[PDB]
Ligand binder design. Sequence first.
Ligand SMILES: NS(=O)(=O)c1ccc(Nc2cn3cc(C(=O)c4c(Cl)cccc4Cl)ccc3n2)cc1
Length: 298
Amino acid sequence: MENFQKVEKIGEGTYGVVYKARNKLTGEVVALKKIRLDTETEGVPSTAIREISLLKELNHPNIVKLLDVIHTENKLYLVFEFLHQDLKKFMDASALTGIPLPLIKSYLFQLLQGLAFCHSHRVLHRDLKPQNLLINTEGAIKLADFGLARAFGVPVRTYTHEVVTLWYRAPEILLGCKYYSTAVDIWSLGCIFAEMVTRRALFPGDSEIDQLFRIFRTLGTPDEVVWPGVTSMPDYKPSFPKWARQDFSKVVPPLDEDGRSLLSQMLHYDPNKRISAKAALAHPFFQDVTKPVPHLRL
Ligand SMILES: NS(=O)(=O)c1ccc(Nc2cn3cc(C(=O)c4c(Cl)cccc4Cl)ccc3n2)cc1
């Protein structure tokens, strides 16, 4: 740890503080994540240690590379490759004119590649969001904090008591499914996709029930017809209001039919009907995908 020199705090993270230190040996600039853990009264669980050690191997161009895991002093530090911008900041900077469709499509395509990879390794993200997607000057976008959920967990509030966003949570998670699948990442990515297109969060709930109900008001309250087994879910209430489904043309204009079609499949209620990352990659929406360069101001 003495091998690193912090240059500036860049994030409060969900597990701990994220610094932009420099490696004193190699001289590289990196993203240092400090996961708080005691020594005796706690001390990093062996389990998490082996989990994280498996993520060090999960290398893909669309996944932020985990350079190292330092456990010294009985504490946990994660050293990640550094990026200058996350998608949230980029969308905020592109709010006035909107991110060009070609770039939106490129990012969606790359992220699906990243997910296809992780998912083929039985590793799910669980908490995809704009702030966790990082981009560079070359037009690449990468999944960040991948696997750190299963490793540790996803708390309601971060160490800074900051509330965790529910906007991208799949319905099965909200309904209490304890053993959800890779389909949850596809849902989150679908929500992000819509947001890049419309320049407004698709389902900005501020509570679990508000999130669920916002989803219901748009996609219609799910029932046994569109989601077999939904009424038997841990948190499903027969008393849920019954809202009728809305047209996608009204949800993401002016996205073309191919994008709307693809989005509809990424937002299917039934996790088993929801399109997989691999299948999504073959969607007609991507027949003319390219890799534009974004206009980034670092
Ligand atoms: N705000 S902004 O656009 O200027 C902006 C945004 C990001 C960065 N640098 C950066 C942060 N960062 C975080 C991770 C992670 O793995 C990660 C951790 Cl550790 C905790 C929470 C979220 C993520 Cl993603 C991996 C690589 C990485 N590079 C610089 C500027």
